[PDB]
Amino acid sequence: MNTVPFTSAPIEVTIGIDQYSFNVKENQPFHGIKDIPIGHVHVIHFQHADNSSMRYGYWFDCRMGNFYIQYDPKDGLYKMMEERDGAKFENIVHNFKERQMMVSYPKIDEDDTWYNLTEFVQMDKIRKIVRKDENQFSYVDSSMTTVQENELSDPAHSLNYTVINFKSREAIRPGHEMEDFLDKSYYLNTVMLQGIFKNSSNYFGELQFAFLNAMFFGNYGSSLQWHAMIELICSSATVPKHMLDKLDEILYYQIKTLPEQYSDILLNERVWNICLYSSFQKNSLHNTEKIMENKYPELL
Amino acid sequence: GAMNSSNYAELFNNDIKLFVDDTNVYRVTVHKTFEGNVATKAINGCIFTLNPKTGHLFLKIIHTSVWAGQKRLSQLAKWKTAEEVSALVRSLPKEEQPKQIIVTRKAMLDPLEVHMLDFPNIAIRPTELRLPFSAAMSIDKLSDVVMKATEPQMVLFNIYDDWLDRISSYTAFSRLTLLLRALKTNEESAKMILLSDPTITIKSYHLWPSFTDEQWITIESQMRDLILTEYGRKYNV
């Protein structure tokens, strides 16, 4: 079990850890989150009571250091920071926990939800997508743009997702124009799986990471990536049987975790009707299909 | 973006552009078989590729052999059309390659776009106009050459005969669509109107008759009147 202390809570903010969240009042004595399961990635995130725009947060893993949170009044926002003095860190942790000013990561033990959403997410893959290699954590917000958006402006602040484009030379073998554009198996298996991602698990991890960036920050480009990685699989006639069956579980839990009121900007009508009813893989997302129809029948 | 009545005169500036009409690429007949089930027979088709400014027509003939042993033919037709327009662009010298291609039917967008990936600076565009290029096989010499072909074959025409010697592209293109519009709506009449007077002949290198200026007025008046007459009959007006 790990901890992420906070120096202080100067401003009213809604704080999130993973899929949990708390209201913290201006200069309430709040000092951090305890009982955080070691073993997966986590994300802590923020929405100020004054500016319901820009949700922002940090992705991290306690196994890579000791991280804490401090407000920066010059920049007006909470900043993740690493403490390198190990002794100094366990010291502030124990004092605050004794003073009990910390909330506990509230994990019901039946709930595999977080593990189901982060199963394939790795910090190391993450820090390639959010390049800032002087920190062991990764910052994301609502407004950051992807590299594919930039092409169609500031690159330090870019989400370097893997670029998928169905009408590109990459995706279309000359002479197999019709074949490849109706049946993307080429693109998926050789170009993307074997070629760029190397294995199905990196792929799923990026897809899973893109979903969460969309859910927590409303990052519109993260939404686009997630939908395209889904479309690539569903629009392929030849997919490993292990990947179909895992994708059904991945999507199921994503759809299950989504706030009910945000279905309109976060789900792309066309991709989903294609995946579930038009594509090669209609028959292969029994779990994802059943949950979509009983929760969001309107979108379909 | 899409081409409509606002951006209509763009067709006639000096930017090379082509229309691609694919309505006559895959042409069948429908007949009953001996057991009474329904079957199709394919006949020769044509891709209809036109430079509205100069009148240059690139009539790619689609031989029924192209279809042999193939499924989802109406789908394949779109992709075969985009294949051949591509080969045509590749076959032309750079300075002649179009800057835009306008597809008469939106379902051609994705096939062409895909087949033209090697030409990213060639904009593929749809249109909202209702062009009448399916009536192209109402032009006796276009249909004859299509019907008579024994292999894939390309045939060059100028669909304006020699009209540009005396009228502008804009006007030329308006005559064309008027004539095809009329031929689409009532072929028998349209053709009656064009050929009634046996003393006005079609030059062997031409498609339409050699009307004088005055006669083209009478003809255009008569095609207008035809198209009006047929609309009343269509909707009871």
Swiss-Prot record, chain A:
**Residues found modified as Phosphothreonine:** T257
Gene Ontology CC? cytoplasm; U5 snRNP
Q: Where in the cell is it found?
A: Cytoplasm; Nucleus
- Outcome recorded upon mutating S236 to D/E: Disrupts interaction with PRP8
Q: Which cysteines are joined by disulfide bonds?
A: none
Post-translational note = Phosphorylated on serine and tyrosine residues.
Q: Which InterPro entries match?
A: AAR2 (IPR007946), AAR2_C (IPR033648), AAR2_C_sf (IPR038514), Aar2_N (IPR033647), AAR2_N_sf (IPR038516)
Q: Which CDD domains match?
A: Aar2_C, Aar2_N
Main subcellular location of this protein, as a coarse class = cytoplasm
Task: Give the family per the record.
Answer: Belongs to the AAR2 family.
Subunit architecture: Heterodimer. Interacts with PRP8 (via RNase H homology domain and MPN domain), competing with BRR2 for the same binding site. Component of a U5 snRNP complex that contains at least the U5 snRNA, PRP8, SNU114, AAR2, SMB1, SMD1, SMD2, SMD3, SME1, SMX2 and SMX3, but is not a component of the U4/U6-U5 tri-snRNP complex.
Name of the protein in question: A1 cistron-splicing factor AAR2
What is the species of this protein? Saccharomyces cerevisiae (strain ATCC 204508 / S288c) (Baker's yeast)
Gene symbol of the encoding locus = AAR2
UniProtKB/Swiss-Prot annotation, chain B:
Q: What does this protein do?
A: Functions as a scaffold that mediates the ordered assembly of spliceosomal proteins and snRNAs. Required for association of BRR2 with the spliceosomal U5 snRNP, and the subsequent assembly of the U4/U6-U5 tri-snRNP complex. Functions as a scaffold that positions spliceosomal U2, U5 and U6 snRNAs at splice sites on pre-mRNA substrates, so that splicing can occur. Interacts with both the 5' and the 3' splice site, as well as the branch region. Has a role in branch site-3' splice site selection. Associates with the branch site-3' splice 3'-exon region. Also has a role in cell cycle.
Phenotype when changing T104A: Reduced growth at 30 degrees Celsius. Strongly reduced growth at 16 degrees Celsius
What is annotated about its quaternary structure and interactions? Component of the U4/U6-U5 tri-snRNP complex composed of the U4, U6 and U5 snRNAs and at least PRP3, PRP4, PRP6, PRP8, PRP18, PRP31, PRP38, SNU13, SNU23, SNU66, SNU114, SPP381, SMB1, SMD1, SMD2, SMD3, SMX2, SMX3, LSM2, LSM3, LSM4, LSM5, LSM6, LSM7, LSM8, BRR2 and DIB1.
Q: Which residues form a coiled coil?
A: none
Q: What is the effect of changing R105K?
A: Severely impaired growth. Reduced growth at 30 degrees Celsius. Strongly reduced growth at 16 degrees Celsius
Q: Which gene encodes it?
A: PRP8
The record's misc note reads:
Present with 468 molecules/cell in log phase SD medium.
Segments carrying the region annotation (RNase H homology domain) are 7-237
Mind telling me what this protein is named?
Answer: Pre-mRNA-splicing factor 8
Its localization reads: Nucleus
Domain-level remarks: The MPN (JAB/Mov34) domain has structural similarity with deubiquitinating enzymes, but lacks the residues that would bind the catalytic metal ion. Contains a region with structural similarity to reverse transcriptase, presenting the classical thumb, fingers and palm architecture, but lacks enzyme activity, since the essential metal-binding residues are not conserved.
Task: Write down the species.
Answer: Saccharomyces cerevisiae (strain ATCC 204508 / S288c) (Baker's yeast)
